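Subject: Predicted fold for pancreatic trypsin inhibitor, 58 residues

User T.R. writes:
Posting the sequence so we have a shared reference for the thread.
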Amino acid sequence: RPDFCLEPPYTGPCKARIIRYFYNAKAGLCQTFVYGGCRAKRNNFKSAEDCMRTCGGA
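User M.O. replies:
I've generated the structure tokens; pasting them so everyone works from the same file.
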């Protein structure tokens, strides 16, 4: 859970059915979420393994 693991989930102003994966620093584990489509943040990934192997790590 390096730097890109503190900013909380950000869906953004847009509301496109873009379901993606993010890092839940509130519990210390990755989880799924809904991305509006625009104005995303670092806490953004495409797979549960992606978030866990990159932000999670431990």
